[PDB]
């Protein structure tokens, strides 16, 4: 419903830069980037507390990030590599509640 991901599919090329966009409607301070793996659930990569802020999550090597607007939060693969392929989500959230979007299938060869 409330936190759109661009692109929605996307295969990329051993050694490119991929940039996934996460846009949201409710003007929440907080935003996060999780990669689902299998028998892994969502592990967190980077999060952020407003325009200008980004923090390490649990798996954070590889990926840079950046929150230029309120509404918009980008994850970035410094140099795409096979092992970064996954299904990637973000969320916004005021306090107790979270709000995800529907996944980005990234496949890298």
């Amino acid at each position: 419903a409330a936190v759109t991901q661009s692109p929605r599919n996307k295969v990329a090329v051993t050694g490119e830069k991929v940039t996934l966009s996460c846009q949201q409607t409710n003007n929440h301070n907080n935003m996060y980037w999780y990669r689902q793996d299998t028998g892994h659930g969502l592990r967190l990569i980077h999060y952020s507390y407003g325009a200008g802020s980004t923090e390490k999550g649990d798996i954070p090597d590889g990926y840079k990030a950046s929150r230029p607007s309120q509404e918009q939060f980008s994850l970035i693969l410094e140099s795409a590599t096979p092992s970064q392929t996954s299904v990637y989500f973000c969320a916004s959230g005021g306090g107790g509640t979270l709000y995800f979007g529907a996944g980005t299938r990234l496949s890298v060869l």
Binding site: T54, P68, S69
Partner: protein
């Protein structure tokens, strides 16, 4: 007062910071608010002023609240046609005026408008020289439209250059241990700003911006800037 040159222990050490250097970098990597010729519209606290400046880049804001060291500073600029330049933040920026367009926050940055300019389309260049491990490896020049100008506008220009040329701050960490930007007002007056952020794990943006609330202007035809830098090993 001329506060002295820092020796190793005064200087924040990048290897002792474990958050995301991208968050220092945000504040400098082509990032700033700037308005020419404005009068303030309303205040929050006693010691700050609010303007309608909007975002020339993104749609981030319609309203800016620069906060100054005391209310006399904001008594003075309260109804002045001014010039705003400096480096703005949103994590933790809260002020009160309704009277959804957006809002951002900084410290200082003000210059009286009338008088402070160059009488055609001209600008002003300010050399900065750069020292890595006591050697002068690189020197370069910065630019501005004003004659008494803030030490803030010139810090932001100079770090903007080094982020991109010398990779001062990268997302993760930085190629540098210590770093401080020293000013050399032409009267002996010699202030510095420590360039690395305080050690630990988060970094308070609005607390690092705050060293600037002084609104310390300088003179762009005469000032000298020194960036002093260290690298450490493997």
């Amino acid at each position: 007062e001329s506060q002295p040159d820092p020796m190793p222990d005064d200087l924040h050490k990048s290897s002792e910071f474990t958050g995301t250097m991208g968050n220092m970098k945000y504040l400098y990597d082509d990032h700033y608010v700037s308005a020419t010729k404005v009068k303030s519209v309303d205040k929050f606290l006693a010691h700050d002023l609010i303007y309608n400046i909007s975002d020339k880049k993104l749609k981030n804001y319609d309203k800016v609240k620069t906060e100054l060291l005391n209310e006399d500073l904001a008594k003075k600029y309260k109804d002045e046609v001014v010039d705003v330049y400096g480096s703005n933040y949103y994590v933790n920026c809260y002020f009160s005026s309704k009277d959804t367009g957006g809002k951002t926050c900084m410290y200082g940055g003000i210059t009286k408008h009338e008088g402070n300019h160059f009488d055609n389309g001209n600008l002003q260049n300010v050399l900065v020289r750069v020292y890595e491990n006591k050697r002068n490896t690189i020197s370069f020049e910065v630019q501005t439209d004003k004659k008494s100008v803030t030490a803030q506008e010139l810090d932001i220009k100079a770090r903007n250059f080094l982020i991109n040329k010398k990779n001062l701050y990268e997302f993760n960490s930085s190629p540098y241990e210590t770093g401080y930007i020293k000013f050399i007002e032409n009267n002996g007056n010699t202030f510095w700003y420590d360039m690395m952020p305080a050690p630990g794990d988060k970094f308070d943006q609005s607390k690092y911006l705050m060293m600037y609330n002084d609104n310390k202007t300088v003179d762009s035809k005469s000032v000298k800037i020194e960036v002093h830098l260290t690298t450490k090993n493997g």
